[PDB]
Design a protein around this ligand. Structure first.
Ligand SMILES: Nc1nc2c(ncn2[C@@H]2O[C@H](COP(=O)(O)OP(=O)(O)O)[C@@H](O)[C@H]2O)c(=O)[nH]1
Ligand SMILES: [Mg+2]
Length: 174
């Protein structure tokens, strides 16, 4: 590895944070060959500008011990994926509360991206792509609609976030 990026997945329970992680890291969706129970992080190494970037992606937003989130939770975090479910408007409304939680407790500056997950389920869509784009735009954050199930824009999301982290990091130094 040339770079090591600590990414966090945050968002309401049931939006598909764990499925996004295991789709990206294992190319699996609710498979029997994996256990997604009590997995705090997954590692995937990608290539940007010919360099090996090791992504340590954390999925700890759901579990009890971090239902009260403190400054300690976001320590070392270089990227955050804010995940909502396009079929659940309540999960989308709570993205503002998750952003406030980052703005208040994150000590260091961090690259952020909003994922509208479950974009394969169009018939149940409660949040238009336009409303997701307008929210992300209001906060100066990047936006994608993903599907952990259909494998839509999962690689694209993590490669785009990693690119934005690397670009910031490379500019600081040269
Ligand atoms: N249709 C569809 N279902 C999904 C997708 N991602 C996750 N799910 C389902 O949504 C539920 C919640 O997923 P999970 O990863 O446990 O959400 P988490 O609580 O944020 O970790 C599960 O039953 C998944 O099968 C997706 O992209 N499309
Ligand atoms: Mg989960």
């Amino acid at each position: 590895m040339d770079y090591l990026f600590k990414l966090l997945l945050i968002g309401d329970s049931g939006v598909g944070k764990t499925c996004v992680l295991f789709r990206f890291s294992e190319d699996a969706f609710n498979s029997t060959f994996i256990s997604t129970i009590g997995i705090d992080f997954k590692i995937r190494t990608i290539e940007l500008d010919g360099k090996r970037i090791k992504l340590q992606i954390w999925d700890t937003a759901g579990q009890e011990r971090f239902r009260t989130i403190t400054t300690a939770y976001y320590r070392g975090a270089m990227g955050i994926m804010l995940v909502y479910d396009i079929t659940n408007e309540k999960s989308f409304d709570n993205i503002r509360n998750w952003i406030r939680n980052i703005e208040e407790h994150a000590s260091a500056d961090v690259e952020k991206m909003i994922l509208g997950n479950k974009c394969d389920v169009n018939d149940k869509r409660q949040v238009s792509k336009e409303r997701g784009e307008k929210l992300a735009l209001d906060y100066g954050i990047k936006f994608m609609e993903t599907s952990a199930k259909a494998n839509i824009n999962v690689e694209n999301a993590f490669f785009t976030l990693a690119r934005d982290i690397k670009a910031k990091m490379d500019k600081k130094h040269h």
